[PDB]
Each structure stands twice: as structure tokens, then as C-alpha cells.
Design a binder for this molecule. Structure first.
Ligand SMILES: CCCCCCCCCCCCCCCC(=O)O
Ligand SMILES: CCCCCCCCCCCCCCCC(=O)O
Ligand SMILES: [Fe+3]
Ligand SMILES: [Fe+3]
Ligand SMILES: [Mn+2]
Ligand SMILES: [Mn+2]
Ligand SMILES: [Mn+3]
Ligand SMILES: [Mn+3]
Lengths: 284, 272
């Protein structure tokens, strides 16, 4: 039951950081995946050899499942904050959810347009990827239906916003640009990547706000955060190593397009992102 | 756990009715409550007598609580459909949820602008309103976390989409236009109502689609729909009567519009 309603007894808290983020989302999130022109992407894909064609799919496979996972797995967070009466957070989470729906749609339209919609891309999820996206992420979010303690909320935000989004998605955006933007390939996809990357900034800021407000109540939670980050790292780097090793074995795309794909710089960016995320949370 | 992902094994079902409605929501859902100019609404409200001021509040009280209730109480429906693998429904429900947030925002911005944000409008919720919005609606949706059976889904969609939205919300939009548009009062608010009414068409289409696809499996479910509609009518009309009595504008025309919406919603569901 509802005991009352905030906007009947009072108003929205207009100065709440999440209401301000919600207003930014409305202003900055108007893009529509249906408006992206993928016609040149289709031509680029068909111009590639079977061997070059496969070079690009592992990354798209990771994103496509990732967007879908987070579309579904953000609902428990919105439920738990709704039950705590955090209306401004809930308002913002509606934009977060609608962003992720558009992200799922974007990568699925690209797959459809380039002619791989019928291909099962699951073969590029190794065991580390599944640990995070098939298991740890849904376990941490679904927990919130029965356990919305600060410990549970920190853990959900950490897996979802600081690892999945703040570490893996950010490094994927960077990787796309280092490879495909340099090569001049897939302009529709990269347009979408740029929209995603802009949306993502708000998603990570929600996670920072959520973790920090819990850490502000009791310093002890800061060490929970750092520990949950470190618990997930081996799967992060285990997925990244797997992508890196696939890429090192399919060098035709880089040759054809004259790219020196520094896979060690990419791996260093993942490590940098991970430690950046850790540092955006303060003990006090 | 996730067994796999539809957009990795395959793609979105591009032809699915709820993917189509999602596409229409993105195209038609761009409005922003923050762009509405409420400055004249403030002047209009200040120029009313104390008695005319309090005449306006009950309806706004009903809407502001109602938008907040549906923003929160749609989440179990999104979860239950997500859990059933209905990805296109979920994509649509993200637009549904973001619409209701903008609706909460619009009425709260209006209360703030005209200077009643500090006032507690709960006094204008009678027992019948609380039965629907404080109790029956969250009960029926929250049930879906543990019981997503066809019977529970039809009950949730009936209470939410056919009664709260299809009967009360539609009637309230009609009421606002009949009273205030003929009076040249609250033009910001009425612009917001026009946007809300456009959004609400899709929300009702979702409810119809949901109830009808469950009825198509078994006609027994048609009779459950009609029964649950009738179960709620006494509270719908109890609330409408309470509002009508406060106003005492052709109030019997409004009252009959509510009955007209109620029967229209029944008719939009086919036994077969
Ligand atoms: C070759 C270097 C590897 C770089 C690492 C790339 C990681 C791929 C990204 C897949 C996960 C995407 C998750 C989306 C999350 C969201 O939208 O919130
Ligand atoms: C005086 C005649 C009475 C007319 C009926 C007025 C009913 C007021 C409406 C309040 C409930 C609004 C529910 C919001 C649901 C939504 O927008 O999805
Ligand atoms: Fe995200
Ligand atoms: Fe609605
Ligand atoms: Mn390993
Ligand atoms: Mn009564
Ligand atoms: Mn995303
Ligand atoms: Mn509404």
C-alpha cells in the first residue's frame, strides 16, 4: 500500500541531484536509433572478407547482451528506491531505463542492417563474460527485491554502474573508436556509440551518487565498495584478455585498413577505467 | 540468471505490436514539462477567490497522486513481462514509465508555480479514492512479483490501464477541458493535459493488447475481466460522486462521461 504521495503533500525536491540529472537526461537524451542511417554500414560489412567480418562481432556480441542485461536488470534498483520513497531517483531511473532500451535497439538494428541478425553471437561470450552478465549482475540486482540494505545497494551499483558501465562499456566505446573510427568503417554504428557514450555519463553519475550517499552514512561501506570492485576484476580482465586474444588471431582487418591496433594500450585503458571508478568514490 | 539474450541469438521482433507502439512512443513522446510556461496559471490562480481556489484543488489532488502511484506501480508489470522474455513489451514499458514521470513532474510544477506546493492536498482523497490508489492498484501490481499467472496479469492491467487510466484519467482530462478551457483559465496546465492525453492513448493500447492476448488463450478470462471491472466501479463512482458534490458547469454530463469511458473500455475487449 501507499501511505501517501510526495507530490500531494508537497512537491518534487527540485534541488535533488537526481532531479537535476533527470532534467539533463530529458534535454540530452532525445536521439532515436530509428533515425541512424546504417546503409553505409551494410556496404562496409559486405565489402569485408568472411575473416574481416568476424573481427568486429565479438565486441558487438558483448554490447548487445550487455544492453539487454542492463535493460532488464535495472528494474529491481528502481523498485527498491521507489519503496524507500526516493521519488527523484525513480524519475531519473525512468530515463536510465529508456536509454538502455534504445541501446538494445541500436545494436539490434545494426545487426539486422548488416545481415547478421540471424547469426547467434553467443559464441563470443566466454566463461568470464557469463560470470558477470549471465550471473553476477542479475544476482546482485534481484537481491534488492528482498534485501535493500546499504550493503546490497552498494553491491548492485558497483557491479552495474562501476564495473559493467564504468569499466567495461566505457572501454568498449574507446575500443570501437580506436579501431573502427580510425579505419573509417561503420559510421552508423559509431554515431550510435557516441550517443551511448553520452547517455552512459549519466548512468555512471547515478552510480556514483548512490554509492557515495551510502558511504556518507558509514565509512565502513567504502571498504565494501573497494572489495566488490576487486572481486569482479578477474572476470573483467579475463573477458578483456579473451577479446584481445581473439583480435590478435584475426589480423586481416587491421592489415587491410593499415591500423596498428595497440592491444596493450586497450588493456591499459581497462585498468585505467577500473581505477578511475574506484577513485570517484571518497571515504568521506 | 540469464539463459541467453534475444538480441545476441537473434534480433528484436520488429513486427511485434509493442515494438510498433514503442516506436510511436519515441516519435510522439518528445514533450518536456520543463518547457511549459506556467506564469499565467499563477496569475489566474491568484485572481480567484478563496472559494474558487479550493474548487480547483480536488481534481489536481486526484491527478498528482494518481501519476505518482502509476509511476511506482508500473515497475512490477515491467518485471513480470521481462521475466517472461517479452522484450518488446519491456522496451515499450520504458516509454510508459518515462511518460508517467513527466506526468508527475507536470502537475507538481503546476502546484509549485501557482503557489500551493506547500499545501497538503490529501484532504481531497476520500475513502473510495484511497481504495483504488492507495490499496487496490499497488496490491494488484505488486502481486506480479510472486504470481504472474494470466489471472493476475489481467487483474493488474484491468485496474491500472482500464480503470485508473481508461476510465478515471480520461474522464479527468475531459473534466479539465470542460471547466477551465471554456473559462480561459490555466493555459499551461491545459497544454500539459493535452500532452498527457496523447501519452495516455498508448498506455491504454498496452492494456488492451495485454488483456486481449490473455483472453485469446481462453474465454474464461473474458469473464474475469468484466468481473474485475465491475468490482472497481463502486469506488470509481464513489470518487466521482464525491468530486461532483464538492463542485455543488454541467456536473451530470461529466458523471456520464465516466460511465461512457467505463463501458467503452469493456467494449474494447473481445470475448473471442
Ligand atoms: C580488445 C579490448 C577489450 C575492451 C573491452 C570491451 C568490452 C565490451 C563491452 C561489452 C559490455 C557492454 C555493457 C553495456 C552497459 C550499459 O549500456 O549500461
Ligand atoms: C467531476 C467529474 C469527475 C471526473 C473524473 C475525475 C477523476 C480524476 C483523475 C485522477 C486519477 C488520474 C490517474 C492517473 C493515471 C495515468 O495518468 O496513467
Ligand atoms: Fe548504461
Ligand atoms: Fe498513464
Ligand atoms: Mn580464465
Ligand atoms: Mn461512499
Ligand atoms: Mn547502455
Ligand atoms: Mn499519466
Amino acid at each position: 500500500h501507499h501511505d501517501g504521495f510526495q507530490t500531494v503533500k508537497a512537491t518534487i525536491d527540485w534541488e535533488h541531484p537526481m532531479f537535476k540529472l533527470y532534467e539533463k537526461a530529458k534535454r540530452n537524451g532525445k536521439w532515436n536509433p530509428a533515425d541512424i542511417d546504417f546503409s553505409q554500414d551494410q556496404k562496409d560489412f559486405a565489402s569485408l572478407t568472411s575473416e574481416e567480418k568476424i573481427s568486429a562481432l565479438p565486441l558487438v556480441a558483448g554490447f548487445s547482451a550487455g544492453e539487454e542485461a542492463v535493460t532488464l536488470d535495472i528494474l529491481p534498483m528502481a523498485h527498491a528506491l521507489a519503496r524507500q520513497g526516493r521519488l527523484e531517483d525513480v524519475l531519473f531511473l525512468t530515463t536510465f531505463m529508456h536509454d538502455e532500451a534504445k541501446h538494445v535497439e541500436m545494436f539490434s538494428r545494426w545487426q539486422q542492417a548488416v545481415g547478421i541478425g540471424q547469426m547467434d553471437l553467443s559464441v563470443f561470450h566466454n566463461d568470464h563474460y557469463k560470470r558477470i552478465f549471465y550471473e553476477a549482475l542479475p544476482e546482485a540486482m534481484n537481491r534488492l527485491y528482498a534485501d535493500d540494505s546499504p550493503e546490497a545497494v552498494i553491491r548492485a551499483a558497483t557491479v552495474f554502474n562501476m564495473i559493467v558501465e564504468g569499466t567495461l562499456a566505457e572501454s568498449g566505446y574507446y575500443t570501437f573508436r580506436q579501431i573502427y573510427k580510425k579505419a573509417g568503417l561503420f559510421p552508423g554504428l559509431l554515431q550510435g556509440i557516441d550517443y551511448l557514450n553520452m547517455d552512459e555519463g549519466r548512468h555512471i553519475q547515478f552510480g556514483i551518487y548512490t554509492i557515495q550517499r551510502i558511504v556518507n552514512e558509514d565509512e565502513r561501506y567504502y571498504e565494501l565498495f573497494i572489495r566488490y570492485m576487486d572481486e569482479l576484476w578477474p572476470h573483467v580482465i579475463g573477458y578483456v584478455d579473451y577479446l584481445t586474444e581473439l583480435g590478435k588471431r584475426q589480423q586481416q582487418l587491421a592489415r587491410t585498413y593499415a591500423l596498428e591496433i595497440d592491444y596493450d594500450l586497450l588493456r591499459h585503458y581497462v585498468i585505467k577505467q577500473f581505477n578511475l571508478r574506484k577513485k570517484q568514490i571518497s571515504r568521506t
